Write an enzyme that holds these catalytic residues in place. Structure first.
Site, PDB file in Angstrom:
ATOM      1  CB  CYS A 109      -0.779   0.116   1.267  1.00 35.62           C
ATOM      2  SG  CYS A 109      -1.747   1.395   1.308  1.00 35.62           S
ATOM      3  NE  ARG A 112       2.545   0.958   3.623  1.00 37.24           N
ATOM      4  CZ  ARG A 112       3.629   0.199   3.668  1.00 37.24           C
ATOM      5  NH1 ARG A 112       4.381  -0.090   5.051  1.00 37.24           N
ATOM      6  NH2 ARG A 112       4.246   0.050   2.257  1.00 37.24           N
ATOM      7  CD1 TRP A 281      -7.386   8.539  -2.095  1.00 35.15           C
ATOM      8  CD2 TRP A 281      -8.757   8.948  -0.001  1.00 35.15           C
ATOM      9  NE1 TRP A 281      -6.677   9.438  -1.342  1.00 35.15           N
ATOM     10  CE2 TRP A 281      -7.140   9.537  -0.131  1.00 35.15           C
ATOM     11  CE3 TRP A 281      -9.208   8.962   1.038  1.00 35.15           C
ATOM     12  CZ2 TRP A 281      -6.819  10.303   1.123  1.00 35.15           C
ATOM     13  CZ3 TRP A 281      -8.884   9.485   2.051  1.00 35.15           C
ATOM     14  CH2 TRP A 281      -7.632  10.033   2.175  1.00 35.15           C
ATOM     15  CD  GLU A 286      -5.598   1.948  -6.802  1.00 32.77           C
ATOM     16  OE1 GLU A 286      -6.297   0.882  -6.674  1.00 32.77           O
ATOM     17  OE2 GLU A 286      -5.750   3.011  -6.177  1.00 32.77           O
TER      18      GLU A 286
HETATM   19  C1  HEM Z   1      -6.458   6.149   1.701  1.00 29.21           C
HETATM   20  C2  HEM Z   1      -6.661   6.113   0.696  1.00 29.21           C
HETATM   21  C3  HEM Z   1      -5.810   4.970   0.089  1.00 29.21           C
HETATM   22  C4  HEM Z   1      -4.877   5.011  -1.336  1.00 29.21           C
HETATM   23  C5  HEM Z   1      -4.867   6.027  -2.111  1.00 29.21           C
HETATM   24  C6  HEM Z   1      -4.298   3.639  -0.930  1.00 29.21           C
HETATM   25  C7  HEM Z   1      -3.660   3.377  -2.293  1.00 29.21           C
HETATM   26  C8  HEM Z   1      -3.287   1.871  -2.607  1.00 29.21           C
HETATM   27  C9  HEM Z   1      -2.800   1.538  -3.995  1.00 29.21           C
HETATM   28  C10 HEM Z   1      -2.508   2.304  -5.350  1.00 29.21           C
HETATM   29  C11 HEM Z   1      -2.674   0.259  -3.911  1.00 29.21           C
HETATM   30  C12 HEM Z   1      -2.223  -1.114  -5.021  1.00 29.21           C
HETATM   31  C13 HEM Z   1      -3.581  -1.480  -5.544  1.00 29.21           C
HETATM   32  C14 HEM Z   1      -3.227  -2.190  -6.850  1.00 29.21           C
HETATM   33  O1  HEM Z   1      -2.293  -2.111  -7.648  1.00 29.21           O
HETATM   34  O2  HEM Z   1      -4.197  -3.010  -7.227  1.00 29.21           O
HETATM   35  C15 HEM Z   1      -3.247  -0.169  -2.573  1.00 29.21           C
HETATM   36  C16 HEM Z   1      -2.949  -1.664  -1.832  1.00 29.21           C
HETATM   37  C17 HEM Z   1      -3.235  -2.074  -0.440  1.00 29.21           C
HETATM   38  N1  HEM Z   1      -3.776  -1.233   0.462  1.00 29.21           N
HETATM   39 FE1  HEM Z   1      -4.061   0.883   0.190  1.00 29.21          FE
HETATM   40  N2  HEM Z   1      -4.428   2.905  -0.250  1.00 29.21           N
HETATM   41  C18 HEM Z   1      -5.467   3.724   0.516  1.00 29.21           C
HETATM   42  C19 HEM Z   1      -6.176   3.158   1.811  1.00 29.21           C
HETATM   43  C20 HEM Z   1      -6.128   1.988   2.263  1.00 29.21           C
HETATM   44  C21 HEM Z   1      -6.501   1.530   3.563  1.00 29.21           C
HETATM   45  C22 HEM Z   1      -7.664   2.277   4.294  1.00 29.21           C
HETATM   46  C23 HEM Z   1      -6.018   0.161   3.812  1.00 29.21           C
HETATM   47  C24 HEM Z   1      -6.629  -0.970   4.742  1.00 29.21           C
HETATM   48  C25 HEM Z   1      -7.077  -0.322   5.775  1.00 29.21           C
HETATM   49  C26 HEM Z   1      -5.408  -0.272   2.779  1.00 29.21           C
HETATM   50  C27 HEM Z   1      -4.536  -1.413   2.560  1.00 29.21           C
HETATM   51  C28 HEM Z   1      -3.887  -2.014   1.377  1.00 29.21           C
HETATM   52  C29 HEM Z   1      -3.788  -3.311   1.243  1.00 29.21           C
HETATM   53  C30 HEM Z   1      -3.771  -4.366   2.214  1.00 29.21           C
HETATM   54  C31 HEM Z   1      -3.210  -3.341   0.020  1.00 29.21           C
HETATM   55  C32 HEM Z   1      -2.907  -4.650  -0.980  1.00 29.21           C
HETATM   56  C33 HEM Z   1      -4.131  -5.076  -1.585  1.00 29.21           C
HETATM   57  C34 HEM Z   1      -3.811  -6.471  -2.251  1.00 29.21           C
HETATM   58  O3  HEM Z   1      -2.584  -7.104  -1.935  1.00 29.21           O
HETATM   59  O4  HEM Z   1      -4.619  -7.051  -2.925  1.00 29.21           O
HETATM   60  N3  HEM Z   1      -5.189   1.008   1.822  1.00 29.21           N
HETATM   61  N4  HEM Z   1      -3.563   0.735  -1.651  1.00 29.21           N
HETATM   62  C1  LIG Z   2      -8.156   0.340   0.098  1.00 31.01           C
HETATM   63  C2  LIG Z   2      -7.784   0.592  -1.352  1.00 31.01           C
HETATM   64  C3  LIG Z   2      -7.133   1.730  -1.783  1.00 31.01           C
HETATM   65  C4  LIG Z   2      -7.008   1.737  -3.448  1.00 31.01           C
HETATM   66  N1  LIG Z   2      -7.020   0.648  -4.103  1.00 31.01           N
HETATM   67  C5  LIG Z   2      -7.649  -0.491  -3.649  1.00 31.01           C
HETATM   68  C6  LIG Z   2      -7.851  -1.726  -4.681  1.00 31.01           C
HETATM   69  C7  LIG Z   2      -7.009  -2.956  -4.316  1.00 31.01           C
HETATM   70  C8  LIG Z   2      -7.297  -4.021  -5.211  1.00 31.01           C
HETATM   71  C9  LIG Z   2      -6.225  -5.167  -5.232  1.00 31.01           C
HETATM   72  C10 LIG Z   2      -6.429  -6.140  -6.042  1.00 31.01           C
HETATM   73  O1  LIG Z   2      -5.426  -7.184  -6.422  1.00 31.01           O
HETATM   74  C11 LIG Z   2      -5.460  -8.192  -6.931  1.00 31.01           C
HETATM   75  C12 LIG Z   2      -5.756  -7.720  -8.426  1.00 31.01           C
HETATM   76  N2  LIG Z   2      -4.393  -7.751  -8.770  1.00 31.01           N
HETATM   77  C13 LIG Z   2      -3.553  -8.357  -7.968  1.00 31.01           C
HETATM   78  C14 LIG Z   2      -4.395  -9.258  -7.086  1.00 31.01           C
HETATM   79  C15 LIG Z   2      -3.658  -9.410  -5.647  1.00 31.01           C
HETATM   80  C16 LIG Z   2      -4.702 -10.055  -4.829  1.00 31.01           C
HETATM   81  C17 LIG Z   2      -4.892 -11.548  -4.752  1.00 31.01           C
HETATM   82  C18 LIG Z   2      -5.652 -11.968  -3.863  1.00 31.01           C
HETATM   83  C19 LIG Z   2      -5.991 -13.457  -3.656  1.00 31.01           C
HETATM   84  C20 LIG Z   2      -6.298 -11.072  -3.024  1.00 31.01           C
HETATM   85  C21 LIG Z   2      -6.201  -9.778  -3.129  1.00 31.01           C
HETATM   86  N3  LIG Z   2      -6.919  -8.924  -1.971  1.00 31.01           N
HETATM   87  N4  LIG Z   2      -5.459  -9.656  -3.747  1.00 31.01           N
HETATM   88  C22 LIG Z   2      -7.974  -0.639  -2.105  1.00 31.01           C
END
Ligand code: HEM
Ligand SMILES: Cc1ccnc(CCCCCO[C@H]2CNC[C@H]2Cc2cc(C)cc(N)n2)c1
Ligand code: HEM
Ligand SMILES: Cc1ccnc(CCCCCO[C@H]2CNC[C@H]2Cc2cc(C)cc(N)n2)c1
Ligand SMILES: C[C@H](O)[C@H](O)[C@H]1CNC2=NC(N)=NC(=O)C2=N1
Ligand SMILES: C[C@H](O)[C@H](O)[C@H]1CNC2=NC(N)=NC(=O)C2=N1
Ligand SMILES: [Zn+2]
EC number: 1.14.13.39
Lengths: 405, 404
Positions: A109, A112, A281, A286
C-alpha cells in the site's frame, strides 16, 4: 555500518538502516539462492498465546503503559481466556489499534501516510448475512460521504474452532460484471468472470452491459452465501470525460468511486478476521492504467489510440504511452469535476516518501514491496522508483486467504 | 522447492529449475527481501570446482561432453591450478563464457541477442597505450557507422600478484559534469567524480553540457593514463522532435554507443576486471533516465514549459506528457540518424520470447523484475505482468570496487 540492511535513495544520495525488519516473525518467499519478490501470491494453542502476548505488548507500547500493572493484567487475562476456551477476544481499543497497525504494516500500500486516520467499525456482534449487508451498506455510506471519501474498515466476527467463517465472496464491494460470450470474449470486466457466474448460479438475474454493478454474495457461519443487491444510490460512479478531447465522453467509460477490498483476512494477535472489508480512495493509475488499459481487463488502449488518430501499427510511435497518458488524465479530470477524492501517482508517491521518513523515525523502517509501490506508468518520474525498499511481514497483517468455494 | 512462475496476462505457468544451478547467494533471506537494492548488500579447491564446472558447461555446449578433448582439458586445468594457483582459458572457452555471462545477466532486457556477440581477445595487452588501441578498435567495430553490433573486449585476467587492469570510466562514452562552487552541476551529474579525476590527472576541461570525457586507463600497479577519444570515433545523435520545432533549440544530444566498462567478468572462477561490453540503447535509458532523472540532465520542466503545460500541479500529468515527447524525440532522432535503437515495447516483447526460449533450453531464466520493467509505461509492456526469479549464475558480470 550496522548488521541491518542499508537502504539508499539514489536520487538524493541519502542512506538509512532498517532495524524494524528484526521484528518480523513470518517468512516471505525469498532465500539466499533466489529472490521471489515479484510473485503476486507468495503461498494453535501455544502458538496462539505467543502471538497474543506479542500483540498485547505492541498495544501497551503504543499507549506507553509497557510493563505497567494494566499491561500485566491484560496478559494474564488473555492467557486465562486462552487457557479455558482455546481462543480469546480483543477489547475494542485493541481492535482499532490492530486494524490501523495492519494497514501501517501493509507493504503493498502506497497510501500509508493516511494510516492513523481510519474509521474502524466494530461489527463483531453480527449474527447473519442480512446484518452483514446492513453493516456493509453503512460502511459504504460513511466511506463514500458523497465524494468526500473517508478510509474505513468493518470487522466481523473472528474465525472460531470448528464453526464456519464469515466471508464476503466478492473481491471488492464494488465489482462490474464479466459476461463470458459465445465467441469467447468477455463483456464487462474479465477480472470478475468467476464471481459473475457464481452470482448467476446463486440466483442473480444477469444484465448485459460493460458496467453492471454486481450483487454481494455474503456468507454467515455454516450457511450458504446469500445474495444482496446494492441500492444503486449507494454506489457512486464517475462518468469519464477528457478535458480537451471532446469525443472521450462518447466512449461511455466510467468507474466507481470507492475501492473497497473484501476478500482479505485481517490477522491481529493470532485472531483471524476472515471478513473485514476496508476502503480508502483510488490512486488514479489503478483505474486509468490497470483497470482500463490492462490487456486482460477492459483493454481500451487501442480504441483510444484510434480515436486520437495515433499510428497503432508500430511500437515506436509510442501510441500506447500517449493513449495511456490521456486515459489517466481523463480519470483525474473526471473525478475532480465530480468532486470525488482521488490522488494521482505523483502526489501519492511524494506522500509515500514522507511516510517513509515518518516511519524511519517512528519505528526504524517501513516494509515496502517496490514492485507494487512504483506506479504502472511514469515509474522513474516518481521519487519511489529511486528509493530502495525492504520487504518483510509484520503482524497485525492483512493476508490473502482462499476463496470460500 | 522449485518456484512456480506465473504470467498474469496470459494465465500461463512455468517452473524454474535452472535456479538449482546457482552457487552464489543473493541478498534476500526468508525474513526480508532485498531485491530492490542496486548494489549487492555485501583457495585452490574452490577455484578447481568453479573451473571444472565451467569446463563441463563448455563441452556440454558443444555436445562433446565426455570426449577425450573434455577429459584431457580437465586434466590440463587441474594440473595448472595445482601447480600455479590459477589457470588460463582457450579463446573458444572465453567466447563461450562471455556470451554465457550476458545470457545469465538478470538486469539485461536485451538478452534475446545473447548468441550474437563479437568477442575481442585483448589478453595479450601489456600497457594503458595498448588498452587504448583495443578500445578504439572496439568502438569502431561496435559503432559501425550507426549499424550497431554487440561486442566485448576482454583484457588480461586478475592475478594473485598484482594490481588489476581497469578502465576507470563507468562507460567508454561519458559526458562531463562540472560542479559549481554552489554545489550545482553543468553537464551530466552522474559523472562529476570521473570528471574531477580526469582534470586532476591532467585533462583540459571544456565548459559545455555534452563534453565527451577522455579515458583513464590503468595497467597493473601503474598510475592511470589519460587518452582523448578521437572525435570521429564517437558517434552522437542531435535530438530533435518530429512535430515540436522548438525541441531542437534545446541543444540536446546523446551518444550512439552504450558500453559499460566498470564491470568484472567472471568465467570459471577467473576474473576479468576490465572487459568493456556494448550493445545498443533502449530509448527509455536516454529519453526517460538520462534526460529526465532529477539527478541527471533533469529537463522535464524545460520541456513542460516549452509545451506550455500546466506546471502548477502534478495532476495535469505534465511530467508524464513531457516524458513521452522526450522519448519520442530520442526515437525519432536515432531513426533519422540511422542509428540502432530499440523502443521499450519492442524490447520487452523480445524479452518475453527470450524467456520462452530459455524455459525450453534451460528450464528457467534469472531476471530482475525491477530492472526489466521499463521506467515509463511499465504495465503497458508484457514484462510487468510476468513473475520472475532472480538468482546468480556463473559466468557472470559483477560490480567491483572503484580503482581509486
Ligand atoms: C487512503 C486512501 C488509500 C490510497 C490512495 C491507497 C492506495 C493503494 C494502492 C494504489 C494500492 C495498490 C492497488 C493495486 O495495484 O491494485 C493499495 C493496496 C493495498 N492497500 Fe492501500 N490505499 C489507501 C487506503 C488503504 C486502507 C484504508 C487500507 C486498509 C485499511 C489499505 C491497505 C492496502 C492493502 C492491504 C493493499 C494490498 C491489496 C492486495 O494485495 O490485494 N489501503 N492501496
Ligand atoms: C483500500 C484501497 C485503496 C486503493 N485501491 C484498492 C484496490 C486494491 C485491489 C487489489 C486487488 O489485487 C488483486 C488484483 N491484482 C493483483 C491481485 C492481488 C490479490 C490476490 C488475492 C488472492 C487477494 C487480493 N486481495 N489481492 C483498495
Ligand atoms: C543488444 C543490445 C542490447 C540492449 C537493447 C540491451 C538492453 C539493456 C538495458 C535496457 C539495461 C538496463 C540498463 C540501465 O537501466 O541503465 C541493460 C543492462 C545490462 N546489460 Fe544489456 N542490452 C543489450 C546488449 C548487452 C550486451 C552485449 C551485454 C554484455 C555482453 C549486456 C549485459 C548487461 C549487463 C551486465 C547489464 C547490467 C548493467 C549494470 O548493472 O550496470 N547487454 N541492457
Ligand atoms: C550493453 C548495454 C546496453 C544498454 N545499456 C547499457 C548501459 C547500462 C548502464 C548501466 C549503469 O548503471 C549504473 C547507473 N545506474 C544504476 C547503476 C548500477 C551499477 C552500479 C555499479 C557500481 C556499476 C554498474 N555497472 N552499474 C549497456
Ligand atoms: C508479476 C508482477 O508482480 C505483477 O504484475 C504486479 C507488479 N506490480 C504491481 N503493483 C501494483 N500496485 N499492483 C499490481 O497488481 C501489480 N502487479
Ligand atoms: C532503487 C531501485 O532498485 C533502482 O532505482 C532501480 C530500479 N529499476 C531500474 N531499472 C533499470 N533498468 N535501471 C535502473 O537503473 C534501475 N534503478
Ligand atoms: Zn527477494
Amino acid at each position: 555500518g550496522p548488521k541491518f540492511p542499508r537502504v539508499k535513495n539514489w536520487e538524493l544520495g541519502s542512506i538509512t538502516y532498517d532495524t524494524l525488519c528484526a521484528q518480523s516473525q513470518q517468512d516471505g518467499p525469498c532465500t539466499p539462492r533466489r529472490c521471489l519478490g515479484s510473485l503476486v501470491l507468495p503461498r494453535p494453542a501455544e502458538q496462539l498465546l505467543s502471538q497474543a502476548r506479542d500483540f498485547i505488548n505492541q498495544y501497551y507500547s503504543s499507549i506507553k503503559r509497557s510493563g505497567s500493572q494494566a499491561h500485566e493484567e491484560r496478559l494474564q487475562e488473555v492467557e486465562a481466556e486462552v487457557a479455558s476456551t482455546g481462543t480469546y477476544h480483543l477489547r475494542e481499543s485493541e481492535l482499532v489499534f490492530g486494524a490501523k497497525q495492519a494497514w501501517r504494516n501493509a507493504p503493498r500500500c502506497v497510501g500509508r501516510i493516511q494510516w492513523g486516520k481510519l474509521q474502524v467499525f466494530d461489527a463483531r456482534d453480527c449474527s447473519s448475512a442480512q446484518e452483514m449487508f446492513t453493516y456493509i451498506c453503512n460502511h459504504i455510506k460513511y466511506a463514500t460521504n458523497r465524494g468526500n471519501l473517508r478510509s474505513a474498515i468493518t470487522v466481523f466476527p473472528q474465525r472460531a474452532p470448528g464453526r464456519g467463517d464469515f466471508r464476503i465472496w466478492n473481491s471488492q464491494l464494488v465489482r462490474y460484471a464479466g459476461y463470458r460470450q459465445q465467441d469467447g470474449s468477455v463483456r464487462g470486466d474479465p477480472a470478475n468472470v468467476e464471481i459473475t457466474e457464481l452470482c448467476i448460479q446463486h440466483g442473480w438475474t444477469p444484465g448485459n452491459g460493460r458496467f453492471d454493478v454486481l450483487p454481494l454474495l455474503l456468507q454467515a457461519p455454516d450457511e450458504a452465501p446469500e445474495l444482496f443487491v446494492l441500492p444503486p444510490e449507494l454506489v457512486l460512479e464517475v462518468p469519464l470525460e477528457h478535458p480537451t478531447l471532446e469525443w472521450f465522453a462518447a466512449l461511455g467509460l466510467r468507474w466507481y468511486a470507492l475501492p473497497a477490498v473484501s476478500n482479505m483476512l485481517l490477522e491481529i494477535g493470532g485472531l483471524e478476521f476472515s471478513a473485514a472489508p476496508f476502503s480508502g480512495w483510488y490512486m488514479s493509475t489503478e483505474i486509468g492504467t490497470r483497470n482500463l488499459c490492462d490487456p486482460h481487463r477492459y483493454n481500451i488502449l487501442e480504441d483510444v489510440a484510434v480515436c486520437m488518430d495515433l499510428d497503432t501499427r508500430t511500437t515506436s510511435s509510442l501510441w500506447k504511452d500517449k493513449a495511456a497518458v490521456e486515459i489517466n488524465l481523463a480519470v483525474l479530470h473526471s473525478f475532480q469535476l465530480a468532486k470525488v477524492t482521488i490522488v494521482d501517482h505523483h502526489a501519492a508517491t511524494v506522500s509515500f516518501m514522507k511516510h517513509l521518513d515518518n516511519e524511519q523515525k517512528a519505528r526504524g523502517g517501513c516494509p515496502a514491496d517496490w514492485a507494487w509501490i512504483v506506479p504502472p506508468i511514469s515509474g522513474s518520474l516518481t521519487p519511489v522508483f529511486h528509493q530502495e525498499m525492504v520487504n518483510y511481514i509484520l503482524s497485525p497483517a492483512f493476508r490473502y486467504q482462499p476463496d470460500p468455494w
